[PDB]
Write a protein that holds these residues in place. Structure first.
Motif, PDB file in Angstrom:
ATOM      1  N   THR A   1     -16.105  40.679 -17.514  1.00  0.00           N
ATOM      2  CA  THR A   1     -15.153  39.609 -17.761  1.00  0.00           C
ATOM      3  C   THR A   1     -15.583  38.742 -18.931  1.00  0.00           C
TER       4      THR A   1
ATOM      5  N   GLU B   1      -8.485  39.927  -9.403  1.00  0.00           N
ATOM      6  CA  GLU B   1      -9.666  39.202  -9.821  1.00  0.00           C
ATOM      7  C   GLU B   1      -9.666  37.820  -9.186  1.00  0.00           C
ATOM      8  N   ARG B   2     -10.585  36.965  -9.606  1.00  0.00           N
ATOM      9  CA  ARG B   2     -10.680  35.649  -8.997  1.00  0.00           C
ATOM     10  C   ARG B   2      -9.567  34.740  -9.496  1.00  0.00           C
TER      11      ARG B   2
ATOM     12  N   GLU C   1     -10.827  32.279 -12.127  1.00  0.00           N
ATOM     13  CA  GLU C   1     -10.789  32.742 -13.507  1.00  0.00           C
ATOM     14  C   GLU C   1      -9.392  32.725 -14.090  1.00  0.00           C
TER      15      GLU C   1
ATOM     16  N   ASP D   1      -7.485  42.752 -16.448  1.00  0.00           N
ATOM     17  CA  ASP D   1      -8.765  42.503 -15.803  1.00  0.00           C
ATOM     18  C   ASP D   1      -8.780  43.239 -14.478  1.00  0.00           C
TER      19      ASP D   1
HETATM   20 MG   LIG Z   1     -14.691  40.279 -13.410  1.00  0.00          MG
END
Ligand SMILES: [Mg+2]
Ligand SMILES: Nc1ncnc2c1ncn2[C@@H]1O[C@H](COP(=O)(O)OP(=O)(O)OP(=O)(O)O)[C@@H](O)[C@H]1O
Ligand SMILES: Nc1ncnc2c1ncn2[C@@H]1O[C@H](COP(=O)(O)OP(=O)(O)O)[C@@H](O)[C@H]1O
Ligand SMILES: [Mg+2]
Lengths: 70, 542, 281, 50, 105, 141, 53
Positions: B158, B183-184, B187, B253
């Motif tokens: 990332t 993903e998070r 983020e 991502d």
């Molecule tokens: Mg990542």
């Protein structure tokens, strides 16, 4: 508390414990936080940073502690 | 009204079966469940027979009763596409989740497309410089190609994909699309607040000058939402490629989470699992998605996808399937990162179709293959150096070890997005400064310099200016005796009145958590529902 | 046997009446102090706050551990993994954070206090009982909820005890206060979920885990968020604990939670037996 | 020469004992992963029939 | 092993004593619960153990505790399969052990 | 391209099209073998035909085997590669030579589909990734 | 492999001769029984072979 951790790392990263042998550093920092006067922790907690006023009184208070052994 | 409305037949987690009495929807058709707490969209996946479809929910299914009315939209999942999606965050089903109002759509496109045909393929290999030394030299990126960043949970794919956003998206003239797949959410808010400060995304009346569309299906979403949000992210990018004629950047991502979320689903679709536990349709699900991300004759998509390798297993069937879909793979290594070399790119596992002397020139190509030659020769010595030390190598192989220990520090580089947590400023290295810098460590022009002078510097200028600073610093032990004199009366008052100028905090006892608290009265015995639906206690039997 | 529906999705009691109470994986108290009084029932399975609902992690969460607060600093709203071998000090980093919040809560103002939840999944019931005696003789139990699905409890109770404790900790996040949740051995929650999945005859994947064992922990840990200013600004800080076997962190559940949480606290087993405690790698 | 060889071979027994200790671990990880993977192949072939 | 705990729990809960309880090869407790799980048609977990391995061990070991009336202390002989401590049968047993007494040749 | 046919069942195609494309291309190449001419067929990614055939057989609910492949996945490739022959003079004398391509994972030659096609084909051209980075191109072991 | 063995068993039993039976890849006898094994409806044994190996 965080204000007593940063003084114990300021005592070690600057070099105020280089004379102390490695066997007695757990005794040295316990002697640092006890013998350095407790009003310096109220300044560092409230200001939230080692102010240029405070590191002088920190380095003044850190040279007058009786480190064990050595 | 009774026809063209199915009822929920059975609910197995994210998989809902709906029985249509009159007429069944097509496969890939989207449905709507009436009376849910949220907008629950089901997407028809299988016709099970006996007038039952099998669907994948796009939100949670908790609270679904087995008689609930489900209406057919008569079309697949349609998302807003166009320049009105610029600077907006959409989820999987095209709803705006950025609280900026509705999306001013130029069109509502279905997220399911056929991949563009063989006659609409473009065979034009132009380089895309990223400013990264290990990327520009050993595995250069094609300007309209598919790019994979293979990594193993914490190796930096990332931070590498954010540095590619930092380096190539500002220099690009077209529109970026970020598909955050699985993903998070931290983020996705970090990238949103970064792009607003950077002016990539403008809010309100200046929204039309935005250059990026965020599509977010993050890891708090159910597997149906994470399985289709990549298809939503392509459809925004496929509109700019086809209709707008633009050059699009697509950043995805963790495209692995597309494959993973189809595996949490296919266990409940009643399929026999394939190898390690994935769905039997792994390669044609991934190939159905990855073949839509192409450069055609009317537009290019430079896609950069992060690929998660599941337990640092590159032979896992989901990374191994992705390797055939890419023009440039950048395999990141957990063991390179443990040396502290960042970006943790394996130079002997990262490949590119651009590393060809008829595409990048024979001088750039020859120093790439010479850098890979001495790094492979250092890898062949890795266990002789372990069990016997460097004392028993040849004098021509101790030159191989010392040079390869230098270029694997010289592939390291500080990033402009890692400058927050590392403190060191980022270095953009031009392409010619990398080819000339890696000629020099190969020929022997920098055998004088130490190994650590090459670590985390930009150019071959910066290793010389760090080899000096490493020898200014060992001379600086003999420099001067620092004494702080006579300062206690200049501007620093005292310690006692320095206490008196702090503000005392009003510390409050009785923490008072009974503010705006409703405190419903939970009774002792278990309240149940009887056959007339009333809340009664449990009867006393077993 | 007759099965009655209660009418509602799986819910636990949340509120200020949960502080001080030891609780099983479903909400009902086990410490023998009567029912939960000043409390209300909310769902264990809540979707995490979105992108707009969060803000950047700005405020520090002081652990009271020197190697943590100096080297691996932890902000309010973060998810920080404590990972290491068995008996390397993973609980001691976690319960030094809970004890230190008792010391800090008596000096900060009212809206800056941190309320802790300790979820004990698959632990010994004696070590849970020795932990409540520690939190009572310290006074940390005033700000601590204790959720415990021990090793003799059923596997659906250990699967749900993190989600039960997160909903009790999401009370403080959603009301502007600050929460700190510790899932001690989240490795023992995926093993309990692997048990339910293989007994439901679902196809096992890698290490016989299901396909949704990532979604087991990703759904749980995304609920530790720092909320935006129009949502109270409250936060929830997660400390999931993963036990590794022979220091192998390329395992399936270990690499799952590493790719979920923000940082890691690797506690090395070689430093722990060389006297270096806390054995921070 | 005999005393530097006595110390360079003490550094080789522990280097080939750290290498052996680390290869014993990943063999054991590959041993457990093999018994898990072959057994999942048998249940998947039996659940298709039963 | 549950027949042995029941005799031990009478001396703990009724006699109010400090009982010892010797489980010779706790691994053969695990291995036999692995066989019962396989005969009941359950899908094996990792390496080939029962899915209920941690709760079949844990159901045994949580009854070995000190209560207000008495105590049960258990000395369990531990076998380690293939001398692999990361094998799930000793790794699950080691999460319950409060001490370890190695007898060496 | 004056002498080349290209059969391409790509990644977006259905699994029975990638399964059938080695047989479709071999039948096009058998026209030259059966008429006195010489053919040369390259089954690029014959490791990807077996994955496409595994998808069909697992979804026709045929019971899986090694790495969830069908049991008859040897016969998938053995009846394909036996069609590459050199015919006799009474059948024209034409020929057809086959180049199947198999991708291994980390050099694991002991993989299941790789073991089958090694025992079917006459020779092997092993290409190692460590010889590829020492400058030896083609990376022939 | 049973067709060629039947020819070899005729020369041994009826002709009384000494026979030389050359079987190229008796492995392929066991392999071919595995390619039909799950389609005869029997669950597989170890590494992938039939239970009757
Ligand atoms: Mg990542
Ligand atoms: N900082 C420390 N200083 C001294 N001793 C410590 C420290 N931390 C832990 N210990 C001791 O070492 C042991 C480690 O136990 P702890 O529960 O902290 O580790 P753990 O990894 O959580 O173990 P488990 O896997 O049993 O939960 C305990 O007996 C504890 O008393
Ligand atoms: N280029 C880099 N420079 C410095 N540190 C890095 C770099 N890349 C990764 N890291 C470290 O590796 C960690 C992994 O980062 P991230 O990319 O978020 O993880 P993942 O690759 O699992 O998505 C970061 O927390 C950071 O500390
Ligand atoms: Mg613990």
């Amino acid at each position: 508390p965080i204000e007593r951790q940063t003084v114990a790392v300021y005592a070690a990263t600057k070099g105020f414990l280089d004379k102390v042998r490695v066997q007695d550093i757990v005794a040295a920092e316990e002697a640092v936080i006890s013998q350095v006067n407790p009003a310096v922790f109220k300044i560092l907690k409230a200001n939230g940073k080692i102010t240029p006023a405070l590191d002088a009184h920190l380095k003044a208070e850190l040279r007058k502690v009786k480190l064990p052994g050595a | 009204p009774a026809i063209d409305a199915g009822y929920v037949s059975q609910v197995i987690g994210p998989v809902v079966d709906v029985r249509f009495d009159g007429e069944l929807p097509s496969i890939l058709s989207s449905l709507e469940v009436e009376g849910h707490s949220v907008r629950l969209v089901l997407e028809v996946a299988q016709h099970m027979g006996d007038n039952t479809v099998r669907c994948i929910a796009m939100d949670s299914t908790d609270g679904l009763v087995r008689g609930q009315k489900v209406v057919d939209t008569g079309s697949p999942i349609k998302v807003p596409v166009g320049r009105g999606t610029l600077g907006r965050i959409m989820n999987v089903i095209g709803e705006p989740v950025d609280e900026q109002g509705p999306i001013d759509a130029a069109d509502i496109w279905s997220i399911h497309r056929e991949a563009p045909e063989f006659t609409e393929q473009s065979t034009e290999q132009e380089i895309l410089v990223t400013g990264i030394k290990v990327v520009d030299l050993l595995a250069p990126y094609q300007r309209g190609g598919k790019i994979g960043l293979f990594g193993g949970a914490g190796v930096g794919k990332t931070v590498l994909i954010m540095e590619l956003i930092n380096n190539v998206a500002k220099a690009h003239g077209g529109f970026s699309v970020f598909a955050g797949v699985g993903e998070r959410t931290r983020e996705g808010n970090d990238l949103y607040r970064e792009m607003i400060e950077s002016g990539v995304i403008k809010l309100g009346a200046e929204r039309g000058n935005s250059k990026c569309t965020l599509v977010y299906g993050q890891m708090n979403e159910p597997p149906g939402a994470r399985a289709r949000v990549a298809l939503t992210g392509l459809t925004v990018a496929e509109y700019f490629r086809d209709i707008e004629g633009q050059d699009v950047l697509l950043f995805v991502d963790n495209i692995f989470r597309f494959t993973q979320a189809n595996s949490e689903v296919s266990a409940l679709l009643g399929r026999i699992p394939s190898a390690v536990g994935y769905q039997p349709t792994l390669a044609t699900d991934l190939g159905g998605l990855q073949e839509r991300i192409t450069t055609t004759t009317k537009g290019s998509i430079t896609s950069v996808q992060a690929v998660y390798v599941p337990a640092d297993d590159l032979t896992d069937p989901a990374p191994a399937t992705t390797f055939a879909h890419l023009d440039a793979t950048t395999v990141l290594s957990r063991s390179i990162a443990e040396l502290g070399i960042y970006p943790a790119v394996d130079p002997l596992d990262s490949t590119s179709r651009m590393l060809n002397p008829n595409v990048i020139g024979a001088e750039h190509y020859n120093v790439a293959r010479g850098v890979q030659k001495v790094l492979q020769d250092y890898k062949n010595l890795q266990d002789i150096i372990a069990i016997l030390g460097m004392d028993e190598l040849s004098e021509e192989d101790k030159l191989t070890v010392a040079r390869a220990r230098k270029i694997q520090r010289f592939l390291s580089q500080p990033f402009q997005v890692a400058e927050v947590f590392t403190g060191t400023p980022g270095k953009y290295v031009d392409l010619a400064d990398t080819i000339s810098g890696f000629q020099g460590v190969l020929t022997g022009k920098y055998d004088d310099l130490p190994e650590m002078a090459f670590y985390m510097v930009g150019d071959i200028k910066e290793v010389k200016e760090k080899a000096d600073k490493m020898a200014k610093d060992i001379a600086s032990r003999k420099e001067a005796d620092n004494k702080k004199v006579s300062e206690e009366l200049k501007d620093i008052p005292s310690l006692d009145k320095l206490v008196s100028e702090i503000k005392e905090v009003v510390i409050e006892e009785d923490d008072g958590l009974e503010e705006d608290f409703k405190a419903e009265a939970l009774s002792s015995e278990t309240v149940v529902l009887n056959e007339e639906g009333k809340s009664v206690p449990l009867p006393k039997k077993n | 046997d007759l099965v009655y529906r209660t009418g509602q999705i799986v819910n636990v009691p949340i509120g200020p009446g949960t502080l001080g109470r030891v609780t099983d994986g479903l909400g009902q108290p086990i410490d023998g102090k009567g029912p939960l009084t000043n409390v209300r029932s909310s769902l264990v399975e809540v979707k995490a706050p979105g992108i707009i609902a969060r803000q950047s992690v700005r405020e520090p969460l002081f652990t009271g551990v020197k190697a943590v607060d100096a080297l691996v600093p932890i902000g309010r709203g973060q998810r920080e993994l404590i990972i290491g071998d068995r008996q390397t000090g993973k609980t001691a980093v976690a319960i030094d954070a809970i004890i230190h919040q008792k010391n800090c809560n008596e000096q900060v103002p009212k809206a800056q206090r941190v309320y802790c939840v300790y979820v004990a999944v698959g632990q010994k019931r004696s070590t849970v009982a020795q932990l409540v005696k520690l939190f009572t003789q310290t006074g940390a139990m005033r700000y601590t909820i204790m959720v415990s699905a021990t090793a003799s409890d059923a596997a659906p109770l250990q699967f749900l005890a993190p989600y039960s404790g997160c909903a009790m900790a999401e009370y403080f996040r959603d009301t502007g206060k600050h929460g700190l949740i510790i899932y001690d051995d989240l490795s023992k929650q995926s093993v309990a979920y692997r048990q339910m999945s293989l007994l439901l005859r679902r196809p096992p994947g890698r290490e016989a885990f299901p396909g949704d064992v990532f979604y087991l922990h990703s759904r749980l840990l995304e609920r530790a968020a720092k909320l935006s200013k129009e949502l109270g600004g409250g936060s929830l800080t997660a400390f999931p604990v993963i036990e590794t076997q022979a220091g192998d962190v390329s395992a399936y559940i270990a690499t799952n939670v590493i790719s979920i949480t923000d940082g890691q606290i690797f506690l090395e087993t070689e430093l722990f037996y060389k006297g270096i405690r806390p054995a921070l790698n | 020469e005999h005393a530097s060889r006595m110390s360079a071979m003490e550094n080789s027994t522990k280097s080939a004992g750290e290498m052996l200790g680390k290869l014993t671990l990943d063999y054991n990880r590959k041993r457990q992963a093999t018994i898990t993977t072959e057994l999942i192949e048998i249940i998947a072939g039996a659940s298709a029939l039963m």
